[PDB]
Design an enzyme around this catalytic site. Structure first.
Site, PDB file in Angstrom:
ATOM      1  N   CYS A  92       0.856  -1.185   0.000  1.00  0.00           N
ATOM      2  CA  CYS A  92       0.000   0.000   0.000  1.00  0.00           C
ATOM      3  C   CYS A  92       0.891   1.233   0.000  1.00  0.00           C
ATOM      4  O   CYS A  92       1.442   1.625   1.025  1.00  0.00           O
ATOM      5  CB  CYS A  92      -0.934   0.017   1.205  1.00  0.00           C
ATOM      6  SG  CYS A  92      -1.993   1.465   1.214  1.00  0.00           S
ATOM      7  N   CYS A 240      -2.860   8.483  -6.405  1.00  0.00           N
ATOM      8  CA  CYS A 240      -2.764   7.024  -6.463  1.00  0.00           C
ATOM      9  C   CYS A 240      -1.361   6.569  -6.861  1.00  0.00           C
ATOM     10  O   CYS A 240      -0.905   6.790  -7.983  1.00  0.00           O
ATOM     11  CB  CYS A 240      -3.832   6.432  -7.391  1.00  0.00           C
ATOM     12  SG  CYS A 240      -3.834   4.617  -7.402  1.00  0.00           S
TER      13      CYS A 240
END
EC number: 5.1.1.8
Lengths: 312, 314
Positions: A92, A240
């Site tokens: 992540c 992102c």
């Protein structure tokens, strides 16, 4: 009384608007020797802890949780296990930026390169003197170019299919306005687009589902601005990390961005990441730089008499 | 630790009332000089709105949350004052938030069981903290305006509902065609949102043409008198049985004689949380009383980093 309830010490932060809940104390002891074993342990023996932190009412659809673990490898700063309201993650990027910023403010690390153990191996993150953090993303690449998809109620659009640590469909969007107050329209459009890709059999390599869509548009003060749709029908508040890595792969393949040159990607919320790449065969090595900011130092409280104690 | 105090800090106690969360601010907002809660609320809105926004906008807040500022009492009678707000603005009353407040104050050691008067920007709300921890709030007077009103909802033909006021205008439907289950919330959202549009289009209003902006669907339940789905402004569902909505329901039950004066109605929500309700008569209206519980979920120091473009919310 507060002393009577189960307590979980968390540090909440955000990375370009995308939040991370770092659990520093309160989850059960994990006896697994490896990070994958510990992750399996949490999932199989202790999943109520993820759920208490990530389901309503304490969590939401955009949050990622991160369990701080002692390092397992000789040279690592720590281990981490990421999770969201649906299950466990492996890597992540935005959460790693959150982790490293949090550790710095807690006095546990100094500027420099830091290796973080995850269930699928090490992630390398550099904490700069000025507090920005650069994640060495997994090797990224463009799989297919200018692929057509019919999106119900909207028409035919073309996009690239690229891997940046997740599969993305990347669209140069000329029709829709990429602004935060157009988010409900962009949400329905990109979600329809994801469903249309699946229906029409458009996948990544070896049939892998495309589970993220990102739209790109010009920006007056960045190289581009995006809208990124993710699993669970949640848009990314940040540019992102994996999606920007996939974009760098496409830019590299087209020659639009030179090796070593910086690309500034703005998000739907006006946050920014910086990226650059190095070539490596048919792939690229992307480096994504961003910042995280602390937002809360919190003791989550679990009232064991509450039917919703461990989440709804 | 010096760094964590380079940062402005807000001490909050988060709780939920039947799934609907309250963020109680105990310290860290600016000093208010308002003599009344209405003046203090105006002060916040006009002079200090960044504090609401830091607490309720993303990333720290969300669409479901209500915040509550704890204030020292100003009416002589009162335990405290409170000002409620959400990510859009300031509220006046908030039943679920009041239950959150009272439960929180008990756990902080500030109050004991009994009746507690609470100052608000529109005067008082009376709340009883029971010995067992449950909390009864007195809702505003409620009444049914019309009964068994038809609305055509495309895909469903005609549905009938009662139109009632409980602090908001509700259309109340005994729903036999739709499954009142949380995993069906998408379908229920589209149905109830269409229903609100159809009411508007077909000229179905509250008194004096007031728009109906809430719909509640009711079904049988094996451990309550009913279970509901409550659609609210912004296409949002209530996680709880809804204080104003359950008050409107009580008004309909009272009008039809379904529920006797003083008797308890048990209302389950879409999430399986429950409230209890009862009423007393007030001329042609009712005084509703809603009893529920709040549970603590976090003791938190919100942190404001001055270098953060989103420090005060997105």
């Amino acid at each position: 009384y507060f002393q009577s309830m189960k307590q979980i010490h968390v540090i909440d932060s955000h990375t370009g608007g995308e939040p991370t809940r770092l659990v520093m104390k309160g989850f059960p002891q994990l006896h697994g020797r490896s990070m994958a074993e510990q992750r399996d342990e949490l999932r199989e023996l202790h999943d109520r802890w993820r759920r208490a932190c990530l389901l309503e009412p304490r969590g939401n659809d955009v949050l990622v949780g991160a369990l701080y673990c002692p390092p397992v490898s000789a040279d690592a700063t720590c281990g981490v296990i990421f999770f969201n309201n649906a299950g466990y993650l492996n890597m992540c990027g935005h959460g790693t930026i959150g982790l490293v910023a949090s550790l710095q403010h807690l006095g546990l690390i100094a500027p420099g390169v830091h290796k973080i153990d995850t269930p699928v191996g090490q992630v390398s993150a550099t904490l700069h003197e000025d507090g920005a953090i650069t994640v060495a993303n997994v090797p990224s690449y463009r799989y297919r170019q200018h692929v057509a998809v019919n999106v119900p109620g909207h028409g035919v659009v073309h996009g690239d299919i690229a891997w940046g640590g997740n599969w993305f469909f990347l669209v140069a969007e000329h029709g829709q306005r990429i602004e935060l107050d157009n988010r409900e329209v962009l949400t329905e459009y990109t979600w329809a687009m994801l469903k249309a890709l699946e229906a029409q059999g458009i996948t990544g390599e070896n049939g892998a589902p495309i589970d993220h869509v990102e739209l790109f548009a010009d920006d007056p003060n960045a190289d581009s601005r995006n809208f990124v749709m993710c699993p669970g029908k949640a848009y990314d508040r940040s540019p992102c990390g994996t999606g920007t890595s996939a974009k760098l792969a496409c830019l590299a393949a087209d020659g639009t961005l030179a090796e070593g040159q910086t690309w500034v990607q703005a998000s739907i919320t006006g946050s920014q990441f910086h990226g650059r790449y190095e070539r490596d065969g048919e792939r690229i090595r992307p480096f994504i730089t961003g910042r995280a900011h602390m937002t809360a130092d919190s003791t989550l409280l679990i009232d064991e008499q509450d039917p919703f104690a461990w989440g709804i």
